Amino acid sequence: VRPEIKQAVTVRPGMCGPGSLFVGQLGDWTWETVSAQCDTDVFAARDASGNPTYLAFYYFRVRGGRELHPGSLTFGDRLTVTSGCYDQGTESVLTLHRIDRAGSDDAQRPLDLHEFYERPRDGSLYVENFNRWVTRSAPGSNEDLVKSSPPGFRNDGLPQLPAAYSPRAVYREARTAHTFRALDEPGFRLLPDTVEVEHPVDIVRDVNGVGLLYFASYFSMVDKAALALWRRLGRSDRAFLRRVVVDQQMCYLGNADLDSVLTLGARVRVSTETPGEELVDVVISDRDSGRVIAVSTLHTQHD
Amino acid sequence: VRPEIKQAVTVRPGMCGPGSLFVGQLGDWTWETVSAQCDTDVFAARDASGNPTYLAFYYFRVRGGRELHPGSLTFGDRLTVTSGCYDQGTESVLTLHRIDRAGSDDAQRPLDLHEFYERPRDGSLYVENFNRWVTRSAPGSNEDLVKSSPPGFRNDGLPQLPAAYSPRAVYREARTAHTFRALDEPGFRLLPDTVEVEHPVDIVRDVNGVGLLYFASYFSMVDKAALALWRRLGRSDRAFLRRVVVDQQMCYLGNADLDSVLTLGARVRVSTETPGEELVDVVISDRDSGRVIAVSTLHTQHD
């Protein structure tokens, strides 16, 4: 058994705010955690062949609550972070992070699958990162990525996930339904208002260090769709900045060439039980290749 | 004398690529370095009064070269980083970072002002961050920030900068000239082509954790201006991604309210001595308040 990684974190400018910095930090922590627990340098990974292999983001969840959500975090906040990986075979790995306020009751507690999957606590942030090793099929192409595994990836002795907690069932349902919250879920009503935004890939902002669309830029693009729909509903920019995201799920179905024009579609369901509570679904399409490259659902509270 | 901070850094997704992630990481390292050397928690700083005080970016330089520039950095690269602060009084502080490739000849060498200011080496990256303590003059206003100093800020015993190496002369000339490279510099020719881009503040991307425009977003906005001018010159997006920035200087003259519409102006001078070498100047204006809020010069090499 490789130990879980606990760290004390003082919130820095580069990991908070209304943008994608927090997600970017979470992803860096996933690569550090897999590197420590799977005896592999994820940052410099190469397949047996010698080609770079990327531990690509595939399913990403951030679950908080009114007591602690990503927008709670300001400069200098003291957090505790507990991280660990779970066996998903040789081509994929699940990494969990729990984030608590430092000196909160039982912040030293270890990872608990039952807590993450069945009894999440309002006041902790729960992060699930399901990642898949991929290589490019052609240099300079971001399409048709190929499954891989770096030589010496040690998934053996990683703790096991029970069948109930499978991220594969979760993301399979999202690719089919274009939501992580089934449309027949009681207590919601679909608004007739939707948006469809043409988004050229932003080569200034959203390209990563290996020439793919940057995983955190998917969260920026989803929020661009969400803001477009917020504005179409006649709500204020000021109010968008006060929006509380208590849960968000993202599936990365594909990457995209850097000259692509993407389409960002957004729809919303409002709670009939709780004022201000709504489910926003965003689908990112690459019309020219015929592909859905992302699905995201946000569970929000606003005023 | 507080020791300089040396660290071994493996390049992570969250600190490289064609965007502003590297600058964002540099800034976080500046706050960590000042915190260690000035016995102050910069992240959670408060003035005597109890109001949050921010160690705001004011003058920022990144100098590399063909052998090592920010676009050299890819996932898993091994670097050494050496960092230290220099006395600029109680209201400001200068932080330097040198970045070398790990196992490069004499990467263990300490900071050397003469090297940074007079004999920079092609193959090292030199970072200068001149930062000023500020508070808001009114809650929810990003204009008319006020000079501050947190109680217990220890600038005493920080090493001294000689008069020759003053960042104040450098940024004073840039606010006046709207360039860091004097217009009468021999060996360049101003192109007639310029751009002026209207840029509404991007509330999805560019807001920091304390509701200011995020310092790294200034580099994104400058590159948005630079790309607009690149396109007006009929150059390809592909070629913009291959652009080498061997030197860049930024002055943060002001911040801006989150409903502002900024103006990004860009002009370029081409080398008459070296094909592909050009100086791009970007000025960021807040027309509605009558303020120049940023100036940047980039020294570039392209193909």
Break chain A into its structural domains and give their ranges. Answer: 2-303
Experimental method reported for this structure: X-ray
Residue pair B211/B138 in contact (Cβ under 8 Å)? The answer is no
How many beta-carbon contacts under 8 Å exist across A and B?
136
Q: Mark yes or no for CB contact A11/B206 under 8 Å.
A: no
Q: Phi and psi dihedrals of A24, rounded to 5?
A: -60, -40
- For tokens 């607009």, what's the residue? B228
Q: What is the 3-state secondary structure (H, E, C) of chain A?
A: CCCCEEEEEECCHHHCCCCCHHHHHHHHHHHHHHHHHCCCCHHHCECCCCCECEEEEEEEEEECECCECHHHCCCCCEEEEEEEEEECCCCEEEEEEEEEECCCCCCCCCCCHHHHHCCCCCCCEEEEEEEEEEECCCCCCCCCCEECCCCCCCCCCCCCCCHHHCHHHHHHHHHHHCCCCCCCCCCEEEEEEEEEEEEECCCCCCECCCCCECHHHHHHHHHHHHHHHHHHCCCCHHHHHHCEEEEEEEEECCCCCCCCEEEEEEEEEEECCCCCEEEEEEEEEEHHHCEEEEEEEEEEECC
Q: What is the 3-state secondary structure (H, E, C) of chain B?
A: CCCCEEEEEECCHHHCCCCCHHHHHHHHHHHHHHHHHCCCCHHHCECCCCCECEEEEEEEEEECECCECHHHCCCCCEEEEEEEEEECCCCEEEEEEEEEECCCCCCCCCCCHHHHHCCCCCCCEEEEEEEEEEECCCCCCCCCCEECCCCCCCCCCCCCCCHHHCHHHHHHHHHHHCCCCCCCCCCEEEEEEEEEEEEECCCCCCECCCCCECHHHHHHHHHHHHHHHHHHCCCCHHHHHHCEEEEEEEEECCCCCCCCEEEEEEEEEEECCCCCEEEEEEEEEEHHHCEEEEEEEEEEECC
Strands B277-286 and A5-10, by their bridges, are unpaired
Chain B 15-74, residues with CB within 8 Å of chain A CB atoms:
16-21, 24-25, 27-28, 31-32, 41, 43-45, 52, 54, 73-74
Displacement of CA B287 from its chain's centroid (Å): 23
Q: Give dist(CA A15, CA A20) in Å, integer.
A: 8
Q: Mark yes or no for CB contact A14/B25 under 8 Å.
A: yes
User: Does B223 reach chain A within 8 Å, measured CB to CB?
Assistant: yes
Pick the closest to residue A269 from A173, A198, A184 (CA basis).
A184
Residues 6+ apart with CB under 8 A from A82: A4, A5, A6, A97, A98, A100, A109, A110, A111
Chain A 65-94, residues with CB within 8 Å of chain B CB atoms:
73-77
Which chain A residue has its CA at the smallest distance from B223's CA? A204
Q: Give dist(CA A119, CA A63) in Å, integer.
A: 12
Both tokens of B97, joined, read 């970072």
Which chain A residue has its CA at the smallest distance from B243's CA? A204
Q: Mark yes or no for CB contact A209/B54 under 8 Å.
A: no
Q: Give dist(CA A22, CA A25) in Å, integer.
A: 5
Beta pairing partners, A301: A244, A277
Displacement of CA B37 from its chain's centroid (Å): 21
B132 marked as binding residue: yes
Q: Give dist(CA A58, CA A30) in Å, integer.
A: 12
- For tokens 């594909």, what's the residue? A254
A129 marked as binding residue: no
Q: Give dist(CA A261, CA A237) in Å, integer.
A: 25
Q: Give dist(CA B271, CA A186) in Å, integer.
A: 66
B22 marked as binding residue: no
Residue pair B71/B128 in contact (Cβ under 8 Å)? The answer is no
Residue of B32, B209, B220 with shortest CB distance to A205: B220
Provide the angle, in degrees to the nearest 10, between the axes of the packed helices B21-37 and B215-232. Answer: 150
* CATH 3.10.129.10 is right for the domain spanning B2-303: yes
Chain B 91-120, residues with CB within 8 Å of chain A CB atoms:
none
Residue to test with chain B: of A31, A135, A208, most B Cβ within 10 A: A208
Q: Mark yes or no for CB contact A14/B20 under 8 Å.
A: no
Beta pairing partners, B213: B207
Q: Could you tell me the resolution of this structure in angstroms?
A: 1.8
Q: Phi and psi dihedrals of B246, rounded to 5?
A: -90, -10
Residue pair A297/A180 in contact (Cβ under 8 Å)? The answer is yes
* Chain A environment of B214 (Cβ under 8 Å): 13, 17, 19
Displacement of CA B114 from its chain's centroid (Å): 20
Measure A199 CA to nearest chain B CA, in Å.
14
Residue to test with chain B: of A43, A135, A212, most B Cβ within 10 A: A43
* Chain B environment of A45 (Cβ under 8 Å): 76
Q: Which amino acid is at B79?
A: L
Which chain A residue has its CA at the smallest distance from B32's CA? A12
Beta pairing partners, A195: A266
Q: Give dist(CA A293, CA A215) in Å, integer.
A: 12
Q: Mark yes or no for CB contact A12/B31 under 8 Å.
A: yes
- For tokens 């602690």, what's the residue? A68
* Chain B environment of A220 (Cβ under 8 Å): 204-205
Q: Mark yes or no for CB contact B237/A259 under 8 Å.
A: yes
Pick the closest to residue A33 from A101, A90, A100, A97 (CA basis).
A97
Q: Give dist(CA B259, CA B143) in Å, integer.
A: 12
